[PDB]
């Protein structure tokens, strides 16, 4: 049959020892759902399908978040169906937080270019920016050009090592970009 849809509540990034809900859903009334994860430890969970309010779903709960639960998740509806769009689930808060700074300034003028940069004293191999975006750290830092300003917001940032791309540092202090 057809591939289902897969999304996380409240999101993809999971604080250490907290929980998420990876929910599969479709309009096809599947009897069962399968959850498969690729990573350091591969598993396959299965649940019975719920049918109420115009959607066929199953709520997988991945609780006390540990490093063996981080990876890329796919989803199947029951022979099996086509695989759902992949989804990476990430552990945060295993390392000290980086610094997030704006090269021009946090408050800029419309049309001006702005550049954010994440830095730390640890040997992080790449950084991540949220409002997603990723670049390799070479004070190990990476620079993020955002172009001419339009609608600023709030940004956070994380660092990681290359042998474990699903294990992120703590979150940097949020920084607000105002475009007057």
């Amino acid at each position: 049959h057809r591939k289902p849809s897969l999304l996380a509540h409240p999101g993809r990034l999971v604080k250490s020892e907290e929980t998420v809900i990876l929910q599969c859903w479709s309009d096809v009334r599947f009897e069962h759902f399968l959850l498969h994860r690729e990573g350091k430890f591969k598993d396959t969970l299965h649940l019975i399908g719920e049918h109420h309010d115009g959607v066929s779903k199953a709520n997988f709960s991945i609780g006390p978040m540990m490093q063996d639960l981080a990876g890329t998740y796919r989803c199947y509806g029951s022979q099996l169906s086509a695989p759902s769009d992949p989804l990476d689930i990430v552990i945060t808060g295993l390392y000290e937080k980086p610094s997030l700074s704006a090269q021009p300034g946090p408050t800029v003028l419309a049309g001006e270019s702005v550049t954010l940069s994440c830095s730390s004293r640890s040997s992080y191999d790449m950084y991540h920016l949220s409002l997603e975006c990723r670049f390799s750290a070479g004070t190990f830092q990476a620079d993020f050009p955002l172009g001419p300003a339009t609608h600023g917001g709030t940004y956070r940032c994380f660092g990681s090592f290359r042998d474990s791309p699903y294990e992120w540092s703590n979150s940097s202090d949020p920084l607000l970009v105002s475009v007057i």
Binding site: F41, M66, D68, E96, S122, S123, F161
Partner: protein, 272 residues
Amino acid sequence: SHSMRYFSTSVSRPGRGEPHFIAVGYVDDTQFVRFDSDAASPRGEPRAPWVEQEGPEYWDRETQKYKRQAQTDRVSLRNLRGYYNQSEAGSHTLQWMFGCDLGPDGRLLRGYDQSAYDGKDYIALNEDLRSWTAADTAAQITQRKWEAAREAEQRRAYLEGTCVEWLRRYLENGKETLQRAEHPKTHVTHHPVSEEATLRCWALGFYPAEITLTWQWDGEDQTQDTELVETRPAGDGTFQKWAAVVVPSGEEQRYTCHVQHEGLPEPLTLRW
């Protein structure tokens, strides 16, 4: 001058299930705790009388730290596989030891924290309790991870206070046996050879394991021809040792055996 030491081992068995975790704890030469993941109901169990009355709250917490570390080792073994580019079909071993060392005054002397992979050094906490020493380029990955995690601070906190306090408590609750030495029970046996002879110094039932056995002749420390065996446990908390020598027949009464041990007020001297 006392100490508290822990020894943990994780062994992976591909195809046989999940790794096998075992851990034991010692105060000086006395085992007092154990944990085995293969048991029907895995939990920490006392192996000395003075931790038997610590309460269900104390023992539940120990059990939950053992299970958490067995789980932690499960991931570490997988990480080490990737570092060394090892396949997934082989069995590999991970060892860990840490503890305190107290002086006569009861305050800290030095701390320990080191690991080994497949019988070779991997990473170790330095004597300063703030830096690490990596054995190879794989361990340098683990180093800068722990540096970025502020982990050396958390390990120094345990050894400098938590580890010192509880060894003191154990030392008082069990001073009846931990701070009371058991003198050795000595005796000499004659064993003939052929027209020469052998003299054996025995020493049984002593604690701790520190002892010294020396044969002599007319007061002169004769050691070249002195057989000596490794100190062995008796099985009830005490230890054994013996020292042998070969001697021309008739000269047997010129040889004396001397014993030095903590439980003896002054060194002993024996004759056949």
